[PDB]
Each structure stands twice: as structure tokens, then as C-alpha cells.
Amino acid sequence: SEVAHRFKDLGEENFKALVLIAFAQYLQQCPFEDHVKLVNEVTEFAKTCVADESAENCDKSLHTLFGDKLCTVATLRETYGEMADCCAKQEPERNECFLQHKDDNPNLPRLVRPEVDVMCTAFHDNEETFLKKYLYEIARRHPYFYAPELLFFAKRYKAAFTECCQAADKAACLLPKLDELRDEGKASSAKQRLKCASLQKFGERAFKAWAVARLSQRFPKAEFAEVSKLVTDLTKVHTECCHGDLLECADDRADLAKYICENQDSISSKLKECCEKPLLEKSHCIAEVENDEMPADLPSLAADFVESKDVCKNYAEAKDVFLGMFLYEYARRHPDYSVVLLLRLAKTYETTLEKCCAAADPHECYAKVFDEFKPLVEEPQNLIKQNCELFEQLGEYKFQNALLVRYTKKVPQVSTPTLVEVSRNLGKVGSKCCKHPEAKRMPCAEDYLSVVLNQLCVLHEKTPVSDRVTKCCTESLVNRRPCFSALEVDETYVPKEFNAETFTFHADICTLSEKERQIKKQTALVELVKHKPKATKEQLKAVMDDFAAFVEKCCKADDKETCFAEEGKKLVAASQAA
Numbered sequence: 001s002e003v004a005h006r007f008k009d010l011g012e013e014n015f016k017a018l019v020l021i022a023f024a025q026y027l028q029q030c031p032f033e034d035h036v037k038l039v040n041e042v043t044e045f046a047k048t049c050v051a052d053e054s055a056e057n058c059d060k061s062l063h064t065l066f067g068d069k070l071c072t073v074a075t076l077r078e079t080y081g082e083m084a085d086c087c088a089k090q091e092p093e094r095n096e097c098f099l100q101h102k103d104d105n106p107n108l109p110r111l112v113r114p115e116v117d118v119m120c121t122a123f124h125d126n127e128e129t130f131l132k133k134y135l136y137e138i139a140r141r142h143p144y145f146y147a148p149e150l151l152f153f154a155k156r157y158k159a160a161f162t163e164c165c166q167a168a169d170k171a172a173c174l175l176p177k178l179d180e181l182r183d184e185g186k187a188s189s190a191k192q193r194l195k196c197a198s199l200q201k202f203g204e205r206a207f208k209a210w211a212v213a214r215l216s217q218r219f220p221k222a223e224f225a226e227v228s229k230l231v232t233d234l235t236k237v238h239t240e241c242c243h244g245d246l247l248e249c250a251d252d253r254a255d256l257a258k259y260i261c262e263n264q265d266s267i268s269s270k271l272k273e274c275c276e277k278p279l280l281e282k283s284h285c286i287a288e289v290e291n292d293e294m295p296a297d298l299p300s301l302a303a304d305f306v307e308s309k310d311v312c313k314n315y316a317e318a319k320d321v322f323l324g325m326f327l328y329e330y331a332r333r334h335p336d337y338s339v340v341l342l343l344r345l346a347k348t349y350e351t352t353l354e355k356c357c358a359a360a361d362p363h364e365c366y367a368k369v370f371d372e373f374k375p376l377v378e379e380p381q382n383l384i385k386q387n388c389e390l391f392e393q394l395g396e397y398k399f400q401n402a403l404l405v406r407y408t409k410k411v412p413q414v415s416t417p418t419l420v421e422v423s424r425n426l427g428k429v430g431s432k433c434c435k436h437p438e439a440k441r442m443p444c445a446e447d448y449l450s451v452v453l454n455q456l457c458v459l460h461e462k463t464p465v466s467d468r469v470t471k472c473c474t475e476s477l478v479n480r481r482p483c484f485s486a487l488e489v490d491e492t493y494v495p496k497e498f499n500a501e502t503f504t505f506h507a508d509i510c511t512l513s514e515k516e517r518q519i520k521k522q523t524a525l526v527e528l529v530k531h532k533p534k535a536t537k538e539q540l541k542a543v544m545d546d547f548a549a550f551v552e553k554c555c556k557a558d559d560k561e562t563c564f565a566e567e568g569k570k571l572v573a574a575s576q577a578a
């Protein structure tokens, strides 16, 4: 019995919370109330199997039980449309159907907080129901959210309200925390979307390589066999979470934090204080722990991998394990390299072996590989350098605006809200990474951009419109950033039809937050580029500046919405005459 096994390895609180997430990530259109009853019904049954592992259906698979429980409310095609299809299937076909129906952008209501005095009251009234809804609303909007990590997020939300609802100035305590958890949450969701994308689109091998490179960078004093062991365990964890095996994922992940903290002396010195924290807090700290000092007593790759005469032997002997050792050794010595770069080098190395180890004289043939590594390394370095400079002169907002015009020109068929959001999240690389020195920039930036671009890939995957996006998003996982970077302004693209319904603003814009008002003006910028690309450049900054003054003025115009109309028509007229 697994339902019993999982119930007692996790405890009732996390068991009930993980079934709720699992249900909310599969049926994202179901109301909270419906999900709760289903979870509680399962939770009852789970306790039946704990008391007697030999009872009724206690020996069924987790997915059969949860799937049967889910399809009690799902088979209603009236409300959920083409998801009653999945409930007609049996396991494991049902679960695969559920996985392929996860929606990365459902038509769900915007989530706007009520007042602080309203929020704090509700938290105190029913605490558990309050937090269940948190899990509910994030999981239905983020169907790939790292589930065990979401439990940690609910814990921190629980703390914030418990603290700030009994503060002198409740709002001043609460809002910074709620904002910090919101942003930190999205970051977590995005990273995990990339992890799941690798597993499902590119396979186990692709993820394992990523895991080797990252863990080796982080545990460079750890022996190869240790990193490899950790890799296997980390890979099983995310394979389960991306495959909807949330309970097994959470259980195996708790086990992994356990192994690490026990064998701390053979992994990393930066793990003390992490292994002293409680369950969720410990697992969270380890995953994003600081990189360890690399051993100052360390030889050169060139000897073992390109100067040895036994490379071609050691390679063909164990192809993946040999390439693993190379990546490990190369990554361990380079926390200043992005994970993707390190993987590009491993492939470059792999391809030059495939060629030379079959050549007549293998040794002379691959005696130049590190010369291939050179432009691979310098290209991102310059990109990070060039973009960081641009960031300093523009600032976050104007920096996004540039990338927004840059990416609208690369891939103009892509929907506007997707262009606005992705360009923004891209532009946030400037604040996030440009503070660091060159020794910490490439990993911070390029791996971040890879995360953001994966969102582009999956928000576009749903309803494809651009060949170039589809292309970059399929041809590799590792070359995505330079593929998108290499894109030039689409010259085959035919300028969109002009419109009046997409440029004239309303007085409600004065009631929105600074973030929303930015998105409004940025949305209109995307459209404008989609309409008039060609040589358009600083004329845009001229039209963009005319927005701000127009909005600033007309919001303080004591208008009857006419200020937004009279210059609303005046803006367009001056724009046309170019």
C-alpha cells in the first residue's frame, strides 16, 4: 500500500496539502470547495489504509485512486470542456492525459488582494482554510510549481500574517513580505517550468547533465561519485514532480535533504545552518545554498581529457560517465560559467570525440578542442557585458522597453501580452545580475535568461504563431539563449493592421499601480512596433515620451475622460505623420 506508505512518511498536514496541489494542477478550473471535499475524502481513505494496509483498495496506485476521485468532478464536460476525455481513459494513460492538459495560461481572474484589515481578519477567523486557498490559487495558476517548495511558501505566508496581523502598523509589515513572496514565488515557478520542460521535451539525459554541471559548481570539493549519486537522487525527485507524482517527489526530496545533511563532510562546508533548520526550511536552504570554495590544489582538464592517449578508450568504454567526469571537472573549476555554457562545452567535447575517436590519428585530431571552447565562452561574456552597460544608461523600465522593441522585431507574430511579459522578465536581468562582478554574472544572467526564454517557449507552444520561436524552442535546450540572440529583425513579416481600439487610454489608468500603468504603455509599444517596424527607432522614444506626459497630465486633468480622448486622438495623429 502506497497511500498508507506516503501518508505516514509525510504526515497528515503535508499529505492533505499535496493532494490539494495535485488536484488544483490537473483541474485548474475547479472551485476551491469542490477540491477540498475530494481531498478530505481521500484523506479519510488514506487513514483507512494506514490502520489496515490490507483493506479495500489500499493496494492501488496513487494515481488510480486520485484519478478516480478527480474524475468525479472532472467528467462534467459542460464546465471543464475537453478534460472529460482524460477521465474516459484508464491509468497510466489517464495520468499522461492529465499531464498533457496542464494549462500554462488559463483564463483565470486576476488575483487582487483586498485590504490588509480584511486579509488579517480572514486569516485569524479560519487559518487553515485561508492557507488552503493560497495553495489552491497558486497551484491552479502554476500547474508546474515545485510542490514540496509550495508547502514552504505557504509556511512563510502563514508566518507573515501571524506576525503582521498583530503589528502596530499592520500594512507596513505585511505588504513588503507579500510582495517579496509573490516575486520569489514566480521565480520559483519559472525555474521549475524549465526543469520540467527539460525532462518532458528533452529527456532524462538532458536533466542529468544539467544536474551534474550545477551540483559540481556548488560542491566542487565533492568527489565525482558523490555528485553522481546526488544527481541520480535529484533527477528522480523532479521526474516525479513533473510527472504528477507529487507525494513521491516530496517524500524522496525529504530523503535527499536527509542524505546531504548526514554526509555533509563529503559534500559541502556551506551546508551547516541549513541542516539545522526544520523540514521545509532545510530542503529550501540546501537547494539554493551558496557555492563552496573550489580546491586550490587542482590539476588541468587538458591532461586527462585531451592530452592522454587513452581518451578514445576511456570514452567508448563508458560514453556518458566519461562525459560526466569532463563536465564535473570543468564545472567544478568554473562557477563563473553559466550552466548552459558548460553544457555547450560538454557537447562540443562530445562531438569532437565522436569524430576524432573514429579518425585515423585521433590524438592530433582533438588536440585543438579548447580552441573551440574559446568563442563559445567569449560570446555570452560580451552579451552580458553589452546588455549590462545598456541597463545602466536606461534603467530597468527603459531597458525592458529596448528588449521589448528588440524582441517584437525578432518574433512579431508572438501575442502581445506574451511579448510584454517576457520582455519585462528579460529586462529584470539588469537589476538581478549586473550588480555582481564578472566572476558571478554569466551564471546569474544567462541561466536566468534561459529560464525566461523557456516561458516564451511554453506560452507560445500552446498556440504557435512564430516559426523562429518554435525553432529555437525545439532545436535545443542549451542553445536557446544564443539562438534567440542570433535572431534578426523579421524582414518577411507584414506590418499589422492599424487600430483605434488598441491605443486610446481610459481614466481608469489613473487608478492602477505603477506596474500596471507600465504594462499598459508597454503593451501599446509592442503593437506600435508590430504596426511600424522597418527603420523605426528613436521616433519610438519620441512616441513613448508622449505617452507619459499625456498620462501624467490627463490623470491630473479634472477631466470627464475627455483629456484621455482629446490627446488620445492627438497622439495617434502625430504618430501617423512620421
Ligand SMILES: CC(=O)[C@]1(O)Cc2c(O)c3c(c(O)c2[C@@H](O[C@H]2C[C@H](N)[C@H](O)[C@H](C)O2)C1)C(=O)c1ccccc1C3=O
Residues within 6 Å of the ligand: 113, 114, 118, 119, 121, 122, 129, 130, 131, 133, 134, 157, 178
Ligand atoms: C471566503 C473565504 O474562505 C476566505 O475567502 C479566504 C481568503 C483567503 O484564503 C485569502 C485571502 C482572503 O481575503 C480570503 C477571504 O476572502 C474575502 C471575501 C469574503 N467574502 C470576506 O470579505 C473576507 C473577509 O475576505 C476569506 C487573501 O486576501 C490572501 C492574500 C494573499 C495571499 C493569500 C490570501 C488568501 O488565501
Ligand SMILES: CC(=O)[C@]1(O)Cc2c(O)c3c(c(O)c2[C@@H](O[C@H]2C[C@H](N)[C@H](O)[C@H](C)O2)C1)C(=O)c1ccccc1C3=O
Residues within 6 Å of the ligand: 032, 111, 112, 113, 114, 133, 134, 135, 136, 137, 138, 182
Ligand atoms: C473565496 C475564495 O476562494 C478566495 O478565492 C481565495 C483567495 C485567495 O486564495 C487568494 C487571494 C484572494 O484575494 C482570495 C479571495 O479574494 C476574493 C475575495 C476578496 N474580497 C476580493 O474580492 C478578491 C478580489 O476576490 C478569493 C489573493 O489575493 C492572493 C494574493 C497573492 C497570493 C495568493 C492569493 C490567494 O491565494
